[PDB]
Design a binder for this molecule. Sequence first.
Ligand SMILES: [K+]
Lengths: 87, 93
Amino acid sequence: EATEVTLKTEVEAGASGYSVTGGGDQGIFVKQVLKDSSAAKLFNLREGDQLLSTTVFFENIKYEDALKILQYSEPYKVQFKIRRQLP
Amino acid sequence: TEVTLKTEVEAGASGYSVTGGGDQGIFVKQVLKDSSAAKLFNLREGDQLLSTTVFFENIKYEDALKILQYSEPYKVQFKIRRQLPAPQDEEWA
Ligand SMILES: [K+]
């Protein structure tokens, strides 16, 4: 279980140029990362990293994309950050 | 005037709908009385969903990948667990 670090990335946009593997009975792991990718340069994703979670910010997001994220995440553990008006 | 909060971590959020997007944010539109949304997440009509965190625990690979693909254009933040080089720094004779 060591040496092992659990961290959060910065909040950045446009994560791409990486692949994942695993899942089901296993965790989700980064398989490959393209050298010049946002994955590498902005998120510092590395081969072998376990993605414990992803937080998606619903800012300037297409309705259909937000909807599909909610639909595909539906069976699993999630946490919402909400803004609520006080009357 | 308004408050920002986080739900508990729970599985199976359903029995609700959303609206908005694009220029606007994403808002909760109808919440079924008898729903996980109401009972586990305490979602209410009019709540803005600022973000969703999905935990990749017992997640079907194809569902996780679709989330990452649909998320691609947008602001995200990952929680990562990284194994780091083991090394042997023996010092003893
Ligand atoms: K897609």
